[PDB]
Curated annotation (Swiss-Prot), chain A:
InterPro entries according to UniProt: AAA+_ATPase, ATP-dep_Clp_protease_ClpX, ATPase_AAA_core, Clp_ATPase_C, HslU, P-loop_NTPase
Name listed for the protein in its UniProt record: ATP-dependent protease ATPase subunit HslU
Pfam families, per the entry: AAA, AAA_2
Organism: Haemophilus influenzae (strain ATCC 51907 / DSM 11121 / KW20 / Rd)
Function: ATPase subunit of a proteasome-like degradation complex; this subunit has chaperone activity. The binding of ATP and its subsequent hydrolysis by HslU are essential for unfolding of protein substrates subsequently hydrolyzed by HslV. HslU recognizes the N-terminal part of its protein substrates and unfolds these before they are guided to HslV for hydrolysis.
Residues reported to bind ATP: 17, 59-64, 136, 181-184, 197, 269
HAMAP family: HslU
GO biological process, one term: protein unfolding
Swiss-Prot record, chain D:
GO molecular function: ATP binding; ATP hydrolysis activity; peptidase activity; proteasome-activating activity
Superkingdom, natural source: Bacteria
Family in the record: Belongs to the ClpX chaperone family. HslU subfamily.
Cystine crosslinks: none
Protein's name according to its UniProt entry: ATP-dependent protease ATPase subunit HslU
Alphabetical keyword list: ATP-binding, Chaperone, Cytoplasm, Nucleotide-binding
Location(s) in or outside the cell: Cytoplasm
Gene behind the chain: hslU
SUPFAM superfamilies named among the record's database cross-references: P-loop containing nucleoside triphosphate hydrolases
Its job: ATPase subunit of a proteasome-like degradation complex; this subunit has chaperone activity. The binding of ATP and its subsequent hydrolysis by HslU are essential for unfolding of protein substrates subsequently hydrolyzed by HslV. HslU recognizes the N-terminal part of its protein substrates and unfolds these before they are guided to HslV for hydrolysis.
Pfam families: AAA, AAA_2
Principal place of residence: cytoplasm
GO biological process: protein unfolding; proteolysis involved in protein catabolic process
Length: 319, 326, 326, 320, 317
């Protein structure tokens, strides 16, 4: 009828490296969905979603985990920056909108081998029933004049979280049962700085960790459709056969990490950055470089990258 | 014909623990509705609702009591943040919209193949009836009104009050169903009022809110009860939830007593979020089982003080201190 | 053909206690309406309303008098805070809208299952008749105009005045029923004017508000009367309400004298909200009975000074002092 | 074909007392309209209105004169506070909206014999474009004297209109090119020479209006078609009372309005509507059951009904 | 096929007095239009307008020249205050709207169809539209300033060429000719954002209008003032005649004041005239048949002295 706690984490482990607690959290969450809606009418409607608040550094998974959860649950998903509102009902609106495309797409599948009404109500059903809403950087609309402008968005989100109704161009949808997942670094504010009303509709606090050299090494190759898995597949098209050696990855990764530490740690994005910086030349020539096989090793990588440029501060600003 | 003061309170006691004065308040209130509208035309329209202002701490019942009142009276209800307006007529608009659902759904079944049901309705009547619904027994719950009180940029708030007058005071607002009159809508306003006194609202309003009723902080002991008594209490819920995965669960008195003492415990030590703290502590305790409960079929978990005492781990506190003191 | 100066006052005396000059003012005013519109075309349109400005304390009648004047004249009425605009044409718009429900439910309950109703109507005429109603006998009450007076960010207010001129002064505004003209609407503006003088409004307006009339603070002795004289007074109402539950209630003179001396009492000690304070204290008194009156059938409660004195309790006041005093 | 400079003034003299130069200004102005539109195509469109800026005190005629001019010329008219904009195109919109009610108003008598909306509109549009009068009140306020560029902005905003542009109305496209504009203002702080040059020159005709005098009130009090006195008489008539104001009574009533205007907030001629309603107090109530009788309002009466004044409150309280 | 550089100046000379460099500039400009659009597809679209920035004092022709240029070219034309935006796409929108009328007014007399029209109108805009941005010097630089140096960034796309949606379809500012004007008494044109500063290649200056100049704008232009009053008083039956020395006087006068006070340029003639033709304009009605001989005496009278003297004193110690 549906996946299970441990069952879903597996699926998640397929695309995200590490960040366990988090995976579990959304798992037990997604699972409670099947549990309720399996209860009898009185409770089937009385029990409510156990919203999660993921705390963590930049780009280490919060979002993927969320987007994936939705994905493996074939659930209407939608992400929104909290600061985007410094019309909130739009969130639920957009969600429902997504809900159609979803239901619709999987309708022309059986209706190929219709009616408007059934669709809309069946999309609503989906929103109201299994919608995931991801509120990014909610830690930004926390507290720390012009502040009540932010501490306001919270009061503005309550009705959604807390359960209300918003009108969409497909009908009336109820936020009552939408699963919410709020994210944030919280380097300055504690989550215990949100308005109590919200602080309590965000029961599950889960933590995500900084990503390591060693970790990068993995995100670099394990994940279904990793970066290396991608370039290989991409240069392939041009006819070029490429191969990354262990030490090469180790190097690539030790490099991503290297800069993150020396400058603006942008988390795992730094891999997409270092990769494109490495796969630079080949990406161009790959075209008329048919047949060849590039053997990207530690030497290769160590060259393609060059020299880290740090210590710009000091001098210029110091006495 | 309709329930009664004491009668209604009973029904409320089913879902809210404590907060008596409050229950009564809304009870006498919902009762006066049946009393007028039982009077003769001159007065039937001359007498007006006795709106309520519930003063209290966070999540101790203010809203449930209202939401329930509405529910047990099958009345068009609607809640709105007071600060939401820092278009107010919307409140009445949304209300009417809800009365529709109520009045509609009230004739799609109780008064009676999916293509069956169309010209036997008369979509020219429903609305009218939906209006009456609103016009006659609408309950509006204005939350944290204490926030649009006083204490530049303040007149922006002391404004929402003047904006609400017309509703409370009695006016007409156009809805996509026609004209509805707030003249008889029952209004229930709520607020903590830790900074402002209710006697800080604009007099025009301060007198349209005649009934002042207080609600209490929720106690350890109180938690113990909200914990199990209420129709569909938390435990009553988890039990029902783990049931589905095949696990049979049971909470021992001492466990509840512990769970509660625990929620309370933290509330006092940090940000007292009222009863929400139970939903919080429960999800923290039911952690483990909630995962494994799936492949943990058949077994029966016996949640006792020991269990809880563990699942919750130790308390943290007074982070502050040091770092800010000399 | 219509009532008369002294004849209208009588009707007003039925619901308002005291506040005479005011009653007169709106009387002669309502009368002039019949006077013109009785004149020949040249003047029938040249002569304009003599708009009134009621200056008074809080809740002493300013609005009842207006709302009632309107009611006894079966005239489209509408009230608006002046500060509501710190779209003004909406005033006339909403007015026109009210003229519908008035005229509508006036050629349905007069000029007359719900199928023989589409007869006569002639929608394009109903409208053309409401527009007259507005244009001819509309009363617009502009509350707390003294607030949009003057005393930066002040021109925001001294602006709503310039914004109201065209209405007062006479112009046209488009309604969803057609074009209506403010030329003849009767305007009644009210305000306490504790800080600003009326002679602080913009001259343009200062002159279109010819009639100044003063209302008096409501006294203990006064309360005693608003408490029982007025058609459908408070006591008259409660009596009528407990009746329904089957309880027979009776207020002794000394009881009223007490209830009133009570309302006044607090009004003086705190935020004087005028007569609203009676609706307050009454509810605070009829507390118990209102609950139990249900299963308290047959009995008869005798509310005397003892009673009231009890049901109310003591008054709080010197909250101030201390804390902010050295 | 149309009235004349001296001919129109006559008509105006019928409702406004005094304020001559002004009447003339709008007269020559409404006349130039008939003059052009009588010329041949090249010029018929090349010559433009000679817009007026009336400078004056509060309520001494500026608007009546304008409202009336419009009226006597049966032209689409519209008045607007200049400060209302601190959507300007609305002016032309509302104007055109009026034209419609004005054309169609007279297109139901012509079509009484025994329509065609695609023409009607096309007509009101000609109406507006051809003889529209726009009255911009208190423009002296949007003059200059930060937050000031907010006002000196409305001017730049009005140019296109005054200067001649096109604005879309729900009846079609209309051209302000030929609309007649009359701007008014007290100008007690700013000189008209304070407006933006662009506008300072599209307001050629400067005409000044005078404060209203005791003597003047005496006249606004009885001469004007439908004067106040003429009105009350007409009003108490209905209740059956015959009333009569004696010369000296008028002289007194007026000396009185003036009196106060000088002593307090001079609101111009409105002060008469004020004093009249203050005097006609009593009678207005009792006139109802006072049938038959005849009240003889003389100097004594008025002197009574009015009482005494309050002329010197300040001092004290504020002075050391 | 179309007029020419020198050929257009002529036509302009007919309504504007002086301001030659200006006339030439729009001349070569309107001419370039015919030149391109005479080229072969690759270039017919590659070459773009050479936008003009006219710098000058108040009311000395900046706008007439432009409005006329447009007129004589039967082109969709539109003027806008630059500060009007302190929705910019409207300019192009309103322009299109205008071409619609210009394209109606022709297609109606031709016959003596929707699709064809809206499209046909659109080519008009896209192909020969003139947009006159006034007092752009105001949205130049000199906090709350980035609010102006913003309108520039807002105009770029138009000038620079983009597309905007009109209720008639999609139009492209790619080829619209833009003419911007401004006094520039405080800011230099070299103070606008570079992006724009390079899209306004042609800089042309207009001069202050002189006494002597006035004398001419006073009588030479088709439908000059005098020509106008004559024509107007004619209607009332009065025959009027201005004498040379009279015009010399009227003008000398206009100029006189401009110098002594708020120099509003040529408008000062519309001013002084109305001030002079005062009396006549009223009486002219029942003054039929007569003939008025407006000489220097007459003018010198009807105006009646006015030297500056206000300032100082009250403000000086
Ligand atoms: N542990 C990880 N496993 C797999 N992919 C990862 C991991 N961490 C980061 N990524 C990749 O890096 C990107 C991180 O996106 P994500 O938004 O989840 O970070 P975040 O912590 O949610 O950041 P923010 O809240 O600042 O947006 C994704 O493309 C993801 O595929
Ligand atoms: N005494 C109580 N008995 C039963 N349930 C309660 C009680 N107090 C709180 N709750 C539960 O805790 C939550 C309290 O939310 P609620 O909004 O009712 O509190 P509130 O005081 O009205 O809130 P706010 O602070 O937003 O006004 C609800 O889920 C309710 O079921
Ligand atoms: N003298 C009176 N006689 C009868 N009812 C009165 C009297 N004074 C007040 N009331 C009652 O008390 C309330 C007074 O409110 P009302 O709005 O009429 O006063 P107000 O002068 O308009 O106040 P505000 O200036 O604050 O609007 C009404 O409900 C009215 O029924
Ligand atoms: N000289 C006059 N003759 C006749 N009636 C007059 C005269 N002056 C004023 N009135 C009357 O008094 C009022 C004068 O107001 P008016 O419309 O003239 O304003 P205004 O003088 O233009 O002032 P502002 O522009 O400051 O509003 C009108 O009702 C008009 O009927
Ligand atoms: N050189 C001139 N020859 C003829 N007429 C002129 C001349 N200069 C100005 N005028 C007349 O004076 C008016 C000037 O308007 P114009 O729009 O040309 O001024 P501008 O210099 O563009 O002003 P702005 O400061 O608004 O840009 C027009 O009516 C025009 O006929």
């Amino acid at each position: 009828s549906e996946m299970t706690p441990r069952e879903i984490v597996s699926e998640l482990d397929q695309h995200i490296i590490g960040q366990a607690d988090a995976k579990r959290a959304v798992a037990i969450a997604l699972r409670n969905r099947w549990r309720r809606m399996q209860l009898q009418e009185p409770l089937r409607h009385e029990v409510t979603p156990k919203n999660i608040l993921m705390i963590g550094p930049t780009g280490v998974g919060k979002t993927e985990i969320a987007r994936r959860l939705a994905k493996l649950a074939n659930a209407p998903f939608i992400k929104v920056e909290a600061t985007k509102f410094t019309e909130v009902d739009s969130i639920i609106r957009d969600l429902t909108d997504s809900a159609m495309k979803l239901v619709r797409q999987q309708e022309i599948a059986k209706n190929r081998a219709i009616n408007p009404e059934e669709l809309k109500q069946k999309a609503i059903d989906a929103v109201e029933q299994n919608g995931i809403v991801f509120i990014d950087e909610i830690d930004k609309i926390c507290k720390k004049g012009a502040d009540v402008s932010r501490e306001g968005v919270q009061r503005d989100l309550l009705p959604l979280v807390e359960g209300s109704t918003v009108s969409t161009k497909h009908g009336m949808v109820k936020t009552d049962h939408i699963l919410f997942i709020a994210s944030g670094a919280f380097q300055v504010a504690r989550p215990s700085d949100l308005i109590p009303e919200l602080q309590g509709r965000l029961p599950i606090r889960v933590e995500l960790t900084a990503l390591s050299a060693a970790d990068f090494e993995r995100i670099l190759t394990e994940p279904h459709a990793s970066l290396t898995e991608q370039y290989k597949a991409l240069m392939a098209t041009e006819g070029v056969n490429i191969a990354f050696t262990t030490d090469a990855v180790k190097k690539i990764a030790e490099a991503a990490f290297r800069v993150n530490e020396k400058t603006e740690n942008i988390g795992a994005r730094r891999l997409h950055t270092v990769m494109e910086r490495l796969m630079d030349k080949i990406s161009f020539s790959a075209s008329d470089m048919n047949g060849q096989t590039v053997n990207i090793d530690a030497a290769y990588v160590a060259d393609a990258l060059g020299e880290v440029v740090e210590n710009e501060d000091l001098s210029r600003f110091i006495l």
